């Protein structure tokens, strides 16, 4: 594999060098021009040798740091957990606020801080690479995937994509808000006294490490638990559905709309069943288009509904691959980075309908779906599809603003957590300064992948489904639509599938949905039955959130320092060293209080005095946690008593006297005035 | 030379010796020198090193209270400290730089413990009282 | 017990392999010092309180046996 990949890469780079002989300024053929563009992009080759090697080194280092990062329980530092096993289980199964908080904070303080400087260098180098390629920044290079030029009407500028996102997002906010409120209302019953009905959700309670999906929250938020979900896996087992006939059923489904049959060698070369322990193979279901009419599917298929839907999705992927077989090699791909996954996913969306399950025989014909079952299914869908949209948009917006330089290098986290609060409605459980690199802890950020693809694909699929449900003449709710036995819908879809990259993606959209740009309305049309119910379920609850409540905001003591007044001239500047000294002083005061009053020896440290909302006035909020137990916060009363006890030493450390160093809640006593005899 | 001495140590060359006299400088109302005071002193020394490395060499080095190694603690409150690199134990900040750092920020260290240059002696860092002004 | 190089905290060494090789083969004063101090500050401090309790309990056991 290494040899073949190196040979292919060398061939591609030498062909790219050769292709420069024909400038695009004189090319008139559209297909030729775009193929030359594909074979003419320099990529990382435009940098110097040293810079290119440094870029490859930092990319590889970030990848390995993400892959092999370990966090360990402070009690048994001999046991440590990776990310993929254990930590994901902790974040997706535990109901302990303390345990989930520990997992979240440990992962973001043991792998975030290692990724901060590497990410800074990565941003600088990638921006240089993009600018050397006549892009204003790296984010512009990423957005360039949607660029369309010279078509007289279908042109789609790079800078337009941003707008087409933001405008679209403005129409999802009414739905998401209600969902947010509902989830919040349901999460207060599982983590009481931790979630405020007026504020945002804590970051670690979202059923996933980053909150990217809300699927694992479903068990805590099911609308009608007493009604079971539609499961036909047992029916498959009873009818003896091996991992050979489900693909046959999916093929029948694809042909029912007019799509062509599978190739003869497709079944022979496939790996539809696990090869056992004798042969080691990957189990991620993947589609392969080896070329020259060679299409294969790899999947460790079991007997489950999830495997059935995954098989349908993969067969959609390979159907798309086969559709543009006639196109030249540089054209053998989807319209953009989002089309392929949307095309694959609409098949899974259609096949999961209870109507199709009844028609295939897995669902008994004597099964009438209740409106409750529809609500449950819709909420399960929304926790995945709608939950990820605000997160995706916020992440991509932050990355674009970082690449463009609109966010200073010393204001990354302060802006990132300021965005999640007012866009996603998610608040950090403990404050993070500029040392942390939370966004780099996600896989797609540290491994240098474009993230906007997951946004548009979410929209496109619905725009497809609705269109394919219009031609099929479906009257009821969209979530019940099925496209089986609809040759017109299949023909309409194939009209776009065969195009591949030969045409602008706008034109491909026009050939299915009849529009030129992405429109979010079908998504809302899909979730309208749920939306109403959500609106009915939030009569008393307060829909929305405030960007001021935080889980640590109740135990915070607010410090305000006035240097220039108390010292006049000869006053030092309040740099980070002074903050270090202040945190050390507070930790010392806490140690003294716990030793001289409660007779307990507690080893506080400067990293246990968490500081937030630093402002130029030198006014911030601090609070002190347990020595190694992040979930444990020393209650404010004890902190106030500790500060009162040793306020003189703190005042002397900074040469301030009780008026320039105000703790806003600790009022000093001047002392009784003695009276003469 | 056959044999050995129980006084040489690999860190003994870069050690700065601190001697603290609480009871003289404060008389009564003098606190006790428990481990919390040692923690505060090490934090103060680390802060001084940070300030020196930021304001003179223009390097941001993240010193910490665990990087100020303390030995030979005695009831007089007289000990030897030396500062290593932020995470590189084999690297010891040479004594000259530590002395310059202490001279630069000795006022803050003195104020932290309410001592004045006579009860907090660094045994090698001699203070300057200041020139006496002369009339016209 | 594991100790890890401060440069690549993702790579960590046990005692029986690696650390013994480092201590018995390296000629770098810095590397050997790192190994020694890391082993004694990552497994010594974890063993202090347990050893105190162990001393107390073993002394009680011996005294109950007329030693
Ligand atoms: C870190 O600090 C937190 C406190 O903020 C500790 O959580 C506390 O753990 C104890 C021990 O499990 C809990 O007591 C138990 O409560 C459950 C709940 O019903 C009960 O079934 C048990 O019988 C026992 O009473 C306590 O409630 C809990 N406090 C909070 C606020 O969650 C945590 O243990 C500390 N971590 C470590 C490693 O010590
Ligand atoms: C921790 O600090 C020590 C210094 O106390 C660092 O050791 C130093 O490492 C550099 C880099 O290898 C050495 O320079 C090299 O010296 C060898 C010896 O001949 C030479 O072959 C090389 O060309 C280069 O000049 C330096 O001598 C050495 N200093 C000492 C006192 O050993 C160590 O690298 C630091 N650790 C980390 C992780 O940075
Ligand atoms: C742009 O070039 C392509 C590639 O030649 C043209 O498409 C056809 O490609 C086949 C196979 O390469 C040739 O045998 C044909 O002669 C090409 N032309 C036609 C009309 O079939 C395409 O036509 C060209 N477009 C323009 C506007 O000239
Ligand atoms: C790529 O780099 C070459 C020089 O290495 C330069 O001539 C060319 O303009 C750059 N861009 C393209 C699209 O080839
Ligand atoms: C597809 O192939 C299967 C057997 O491989 C065959 O039974 C079926 O009829 C074919 N499809 C059509 C539309 O003929
Ligand atoms: C289902 O329909 C019944 C009958 O109108 C109604 O009372 C109930 O509220 C509906 N529930 C949902 C979730 O639509
Ligand atoms: C589609 O056509 C097949 C073949 O006639 C039929 O069995 C099935 O009921 C039809 N409807 C659906 C939803 O599959
Ligand atoms: C003010 O009164 C408090 C106790 O009420 C005391 O600790 C404090 O020292 C007094 N302030 C003086 C005497 O300056
Ligand atoms: C003594 O002189 C030094 C420089 O030689 C100076 O930094 C220090 O402040 C002086 N002490 C005073 C003025 O009290
Ligand atoms: Zn896929």
Author numbering:
A (entry chain A): 62 to 738
B (entry chain B): 603 to 738
C (entry chain B): 130 to 196
What does the paper say about this structure?
SIT1 belongs to the SLC6 gene family of amino acid and amine transporters, and the larger Neurotransmitter Sodium Symporter (NSS) superfamily. As with the homologous ACE2-B0AT1 complex, the structure is a dimer of heterodimers where homodimerization of ACE2 is mediated primarily by its neck domain while the ACE2 and transporter subunits interact via three distinct sets of contacts.
Single-particle cryo-EM analysis ultimately yielded a nominal 3.24 Å map of the ACE2-SIT1 complex, determined in the presence of pipecolate. While the 2:2 ACE2-SIT1 complex with the peptidase domain in the closed conformation yielded the highest-resolution map for the entire complex, the map is best in ACE2’s neck region and less detailed in the transporter. This movement between open and closed conformations occurs as a 30° rigid-body rotation around a hinge at residues 612-617 in the loop between peptidase and collectrin-like domains. SIT1 is in an occluded conformation with the active site inaccessible to both the cytoplasm and extracellular space.
